[PDB]
Amino acid sequence: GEAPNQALLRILKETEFKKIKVLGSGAFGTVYKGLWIPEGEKVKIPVAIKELREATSPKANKEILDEAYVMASVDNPHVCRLLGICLTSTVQLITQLMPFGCLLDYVREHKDNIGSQYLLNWCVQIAKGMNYLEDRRLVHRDLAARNVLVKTPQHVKITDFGLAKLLHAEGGKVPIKWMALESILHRIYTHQSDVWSYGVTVWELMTFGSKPYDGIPASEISSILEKGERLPQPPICTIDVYMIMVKCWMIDADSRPKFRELIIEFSKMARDPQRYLVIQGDERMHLPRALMDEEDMDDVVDADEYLI
Numbered sequence: 372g373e374a375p376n377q378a379l380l381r382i383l384k385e386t387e388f389k390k391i392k393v394l395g396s397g398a399f400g401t402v403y404k405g406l407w408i409p410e411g412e413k414v415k416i417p418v419a420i421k422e423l424r425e426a427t428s429p430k431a432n433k434e435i436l437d438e439a440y441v442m443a444s445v446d447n448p449h450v451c452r453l454l455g456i457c458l459t460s461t462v463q464l465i466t467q468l469m470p471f472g473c474l475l476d477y478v479r480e481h482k483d484n485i486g487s488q489y490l491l492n493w494c495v496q497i498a499k500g501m502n503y504l505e506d507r508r509l510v511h512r513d514l515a516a517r518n519v520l521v522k523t524p525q526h527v528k529i530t531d532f533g534l535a536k537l538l539h540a541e542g543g544k545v546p547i548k549w550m551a552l553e554s555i556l557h558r559i560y561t562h563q564s565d566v567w568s569y570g571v572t573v574w575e576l577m578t579f580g581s582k583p584y585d586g587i588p589a590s591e592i593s594s595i596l597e598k599g600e601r602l603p604q605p606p607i608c609t610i611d612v613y614m615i616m617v618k619c620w621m622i623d624a625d626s627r628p629k630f631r632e633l634i635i636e637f638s639k640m641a642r643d644p645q646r647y648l649v650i651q652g653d654e655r656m657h658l659p660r661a662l663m664d665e666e667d668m669d670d671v672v673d674a675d676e677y678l679i
């Protein structure tokens with residue numbers, strides 16, 4: 372007698388969109404910037420539109436609808452809410468547009484203009500998202516800076532439920548460098564496996580978007596982590612913060628911190644952020660309508676403020 376999933380799935384009309392351009396084309400698929408105008412509502416919601424790069428395969432539609440099923444359930448301010456789907460030739464997914472791209476891109480673009488209060492706030496907001504997924508018996512299995520988006524520089528959410536599953540998966544092509552040891556060796560996945568991923572995600576941000584193990588082919592990694600080696604201490608990181616990362620990369624998964632705790636410990640550090648991250652001119656830096664300004668600005672509503 373498992374709980375019944377009562378989530379409403381919404382079906383949207385191609386007539387109600389306007390694919391302004393392509394935001395990004397990658398291995399994940401193709402994401403288009405769009406504007407969704409629901410008919411009679413007199414509101415204009417900016418959206419992103421996900422669609423695998425292959426034309427209408429029966430296999431492609433299977434996997435999109437599994438990503439749709441997962442995101443249809445989740446409601447959290449640090450997890451992408453699926454607004455609905457459009458049933459065209461290929462199935463298209465539709466969420467709120469996250470205008471400042473993925474976080475990995477953002478930190479690389481703003482290496483010289485990001486303070487500690489942003490970095491620490493991000494670590495919190497991610498840990499908050501991941502904790503919400505833990506509360507919904509749901510393991511993400513692909514957490515990384517690339518799969519975190521930026522609604523504003525002050526607000527991030529978690530994306531890509533491609534590999535996500537509920538409650539041991541038999542495996543295919545996976546990102547080794549963000550995976551726990553037991554996930555590489557025995558292909559066992561769990562909430563604490565995502566903590567390892569979360570640890571590497573933090574290292575990603577604190578190194579202003581370095582590639583983990585830059586130039587080390589992925590077959591080797593299992594051999595390195597078995598030999599007790601882990602990622603280095605970033606230069607801006609105190610032992611305090613680096614100690615938290617190292618605790619995510621423990622052999623024993625019980626010994627890893629829980630998202631619950633990570634939320635608290637980072638929340639604490641965000642109150643006095645210069646005690647934990649030492650950055651050159653940390654005090655000076657501040658980030659962003661003075662940019663945004665698109666065509667017809669009247670009757671525009673952020674998705675966050677619409678269905679609810």
Ligand SMILES: COc1c(Cl)cccc1Nc1c(-c2ccncc2OC[C@H]2CCCO2)[nH]c2c1C(=O)NCC2
Nearest residue numbers: 395399402419420421451464466468469472473530531
């Ligand atoms: C939540 O699932 C989506 C759904 Cl249902 C619909 C559209 C997009 C996504 N999600 C993603 C975005 C994205 C989201 C919202 N706005 C914009 C965006 O794309 C921005 C570009 C910058 C480079 C990289 O994407 N981006 C990536 C994804 C993704 O799923 N995987 C990795 C990349």
